[PDB]
């Protein structure tokens, strides 16, 4: 007439998430050799410029993690 | 007629979020050889110039965890 | 006819987040080999310049950690 | 009847030695999915072993830079 | 009858070693998904073993830089 | 008949050097998921073992600049 139960359930799992810019960037512009050199800039009304500029923009509204777990045992 | 019940769920579980820039930035702007160098640079009205500069910007909305966990055991 | 109820539920998990600028940055603008340099630089009404400069935005309004758990054990 | 000499070499050159491991190394060894696993390493009398190790060895000698300059002016 | 000598060698050179281990090394040995996990070792009489170690040796008797430089102006 | 001499050599040089274990080391051993792991060791007579440990040896005999420079300016 006796009952035993063993409830024992075991979560060992790894959820991870690695979202954005990840990879390495190198920017080497310029470093030539020249004699004589001469630049010359004259910019003007609504100009907008980039030289040998980086620029890095990393938007993450996403890579959230959820996790939803429910247990229940009901007896009788 | 007796009974037992044992309740032991265990939880080993890892959540991770990683979000946004995380690669790494080299920038090596210039640095040539020249013998005579001239730079002259005239910039009037609305003008917006990057020579050389390192923008970087990073926008995290995200990567938020959620865990959610319900443990329920009846009898009658 | 005895009844014995053992309610040892484990938590052991790890949750973590990690959000923004992660990644290293080097920026070595400049630093050649010149005999001689000039420059003339002449900015006039609403300029904006970067000049091997560095500027790096971070903005988390995310990665928070949530965590709900309920126990619940009833008996008769 | 006059003389006027001018004597103004110049040396804008760049010399750069980069000798040895210049690469990148990833090693990601094991990391499977199995169920049941069971080792049984035995090892006697002069036995050398490597399991999922890095060895990087580097020897550099060379890579060394030389500069021999000589400026002679010799008058009457 | 007069004379003028003018002596002005200029020296903006740029001399760089750069020697031995230079990359980067990523090692991630492991990290497996198992449930049943056993392991052995059973080692006597002269063994040497690695498991998942990393060893990075370098040896640098070389990378020097020398520069020798004469200057030499006689007037009668 | 009057004489003018000038000695203005100028040195703007730079000599560099970087020498031994220059790149970073990322040793990320371990770290999986296990239900139940054992492990059994037993090591007898001169073993050397080594378990996700990290060695990192540098010598540089090397590296050293050296830079040797005469002026001589004779008159009569």
């Given at each position: ?66 996790k939803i777990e429910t247990h229940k045992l009901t007896?009788?």
């Open positions: 007439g006796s009952v035993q139960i063993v409830y024992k359930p075991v979560d060992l799992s790894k959820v991870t998430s690695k979202c954005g810019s990840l990879g390495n960037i190198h920017h080497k512009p310029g470093g030539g050799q020249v004699e004589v050199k001469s630049e010359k800039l004259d910019f003007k009304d609504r100009v907008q410029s980039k030289i040998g500029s980086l620029d890095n923009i990393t938007h993450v509204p996403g890579g959230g993690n959820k007896f009788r």
